[PDB]
């Protein structure tokens, strides 16, 4: 009886088997219909004849009919399993409405007929993936970035910070500053190349101006990238200006504070007797935390805001692109967890509202 772990994101579904150290399936959270329907890589493959939709926006499920197709495709096509023989752990955004929790639970028991399920908060799973139950997570993915302070397994809802700026916006920005330079990147196919360039050559500068100032006076920070058609292109200060937007959101016209400031604000919204612990346990998760140098930069920026009495420590494990999923694979593997599952029998007597009492 293997447990399934499905982490649904705004951009990517990460799904697999409890016990594994990595998700077996990772594909786009997209459903396509013509001008019945296609999902994932095949919807992306046929994007030029389909209307694509993202059923999850800013980590929240907003299209339930399409969400059912993504789950159907995850179970039957990607993982190649029957949903009725496996306990299924799902994940959810911070500050995710109660209605969503019930609908999600309802669909899992009434439509997929799962033997048991549980829903966990994504940031809490990332913290668990780091070997901690207390700390503050920065979760930055494709559609949204969140700061989630957590005390002994429990997210502190009153102190959560949300920033509507993540990887999708960074790719759009890298594309826009590459044109400004003089490169051409027009088609949707070409956009996928820019996303690839961002994941391979972008990084976070320790000091932006010294980097920007060095960029003007030298060719030490240049890197080449081979396009699919053989042609080789050089990118210099776009590498570090691309992810600077996380720290300076005004780069794409947004008034809000940067990830260092939201982190500090989040910590100052919490009770004073736990702040020492939050500062010492800043955990980074999500794909948009993957830029080299991002831990050191955060370390520096928090240090400037925080009292110097505080030990600051940023934990950014190399597997953090999937640390929600890894957290879920760990949690669903534990024998102590096997009672925490909501069972089909419990659902059949309590209804969808059983999820608020057990999760
Ligand atoms: C050893 O490998 C085995 C495998 O066993 C293992 C199953 C592993 C499953 C998934 C996995 C996914 O990625 C990894 N491992 C990597 C090794 C990972 O990358 C670096 C390291 C990982 O990120 C380490 C995390 C450490 C977490 C520590 C504490 C947590 C905060 C939990 C917390 C969730 C709990 O407090 C919640 C509460 C109950 O509500 O602490 C806890 O309390 C209780 C337990 C914590 C267990 C942690 C990890 C392991 C290794 C558990 C074995 C069981 O099982 C498969 C089936 C076998 O086949 C393998 O045999 C090869
Ligand atoms: N090595 C990398 N460097 C930079 N960015 C990366 C890297 N790998 C993945 N990303 C980006 O991370 C994003 C996907 O990450 P993730 O799965 O954490 O988000 P999600 O769960 O789909 O979305 P959200 O958490 O916003 O709902 C994509 O925009 C992708 O380009
Ligand atoms: Mg996510």
Swiss-Prot record:
Keywords: Acetylation, ADP-ribosylation, ATP-binding, Cytoplasm, Cytoskeleton, Hydrolase, Methylation, Muscle protein, Nucleotide-binding, Oxidation. PROSITE patterns: ACTINS_1, ACTINS_2, ACTINS_ACT_LIKE. The modification ADP-ribosylarginine is found at residue 162. Coiled coil: none annotated. SUPFAM superfamilies: Actin-like ATPase domain. The keyword Metal-binding does not apply. It is an enzyme of class 3 (hydrolase). InterPro entries: Actin (IPR004000), Actin/actin-like_CS (IPR020902), Actin_CS (IPR004001), ATPase_NBD (IPR043129). Its main location: cytoplasm. The modification N6-methyllysine is found at residue 69. One of its GO terms (biological process) is actin filament bundle assembly. The modification N6-malonyllysine is found at residue 46. Gene3D superfamilies: 3.30.420.40, Actin, Chain A, domain 4. Residues 95-108, 343-355 are annotated as: Interaction with alpha-actinin. Transmembrane segments: none annotated. PANTHER family: ACTIN. Polymerization of globular actin (G-actin) leads to a structural filament (F-actin) in the form of a two-stranded helix. Each actin can bind to 4 others. Interacts with alpha-actinin. Identified in a complex composed of ACTA1, COBL, GSN and TMSB4X. Interacts with TTID. Interacts (via its C-terminus) with USP25. In vertebrates 3 main groups of actin isoforms, alpha, beta and gamma have been identified. The alpha actins are found in muscle tissues and are a major constituent of the contractile apparatus. The beta and gamma actins coexist in most cell types as components of the cytoskeleton and as mediators of internal cell motility. This is Actin, alpha skeletal muscle. The lineage of its organism: Eukaryota, Metazoa, Chordata, Craniata, Vertebrata.
């Amino acid at each position: 009886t293997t447990a399934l772990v499905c982490d649904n994101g705004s951009g990517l579904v990460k799904a697999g088997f409890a016990g594994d150290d990595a998700p077996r399936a990772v594909f786009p959270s997209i459903v396509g219909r013509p001008r019945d329907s296609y999902v994932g890589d095949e919807a992306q493959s046929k994007r030029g004849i389909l209307t694509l939709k993202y059923p999850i926006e800013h980590g929240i499920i907003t299209n339930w009919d399409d969400m059912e197709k993504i789950w159907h495709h995850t179970f039957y096509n990607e993982l190649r399993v029957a949903p009725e023989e496996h306990p299924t752990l799902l994940t959810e955004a911070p500050l995710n409405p109660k209605a969503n929790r019930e609908k999600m639970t309802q669909i899992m028991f009434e439509t997929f007929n799962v033997p048991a399920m549980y829903v966990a908060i994504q940031a809490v799973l990332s913290l668990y993936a780091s070997g901690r139950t207390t700390g503050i997570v920065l979760d930055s993915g494709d559609g949204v970035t969140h700061n989630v302070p957590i005390y002994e397994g429990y997210a502190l809802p009153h102190a959560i910070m949300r920033l509507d700026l993540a990887g999708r916006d960074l790719t759009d920005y890298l594309m826009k500053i590459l044109t400004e330079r003089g490169y051409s990147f027009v088609t949707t196919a070409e956009r996928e190349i820019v996303r690839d360039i961002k994941e391979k050559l972008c990084y976070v500068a320790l000091d932006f101006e010294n980097e920007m100032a060095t960029a003007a006076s030298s060719s030490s920070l240049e890197k080449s990238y081979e396009l699919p058609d053989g042609q080789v292109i050089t990118i210099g200060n776009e590498r570090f200006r691309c992810p600077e937007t996380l720290f300076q959101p005004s780069f794409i016209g947004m008034e809000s504070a940067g990830i260092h400031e939201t982190t500090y604000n989040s910590i100052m919204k919490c009770d004073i007797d736990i702040r020492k612990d939050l500062y010492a346990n800043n955990v980074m998760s999500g794909g948009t935390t993957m830029y080299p140098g991002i831990a050191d930069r955060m370390q520096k920026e928090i240090t400037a805001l925080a009292p110097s009495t505080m030990k600051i420590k940023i934990i950014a494990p190399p597997e953090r692109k999937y640390s929600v999923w890894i957290g879920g694979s760990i949690l669903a593997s534990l024998s102590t967890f096997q009672q925490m599952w909501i069972t089909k029998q419990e659902y059949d007597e309590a209804g969808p509202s059983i999820v608020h009492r057990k999760c």
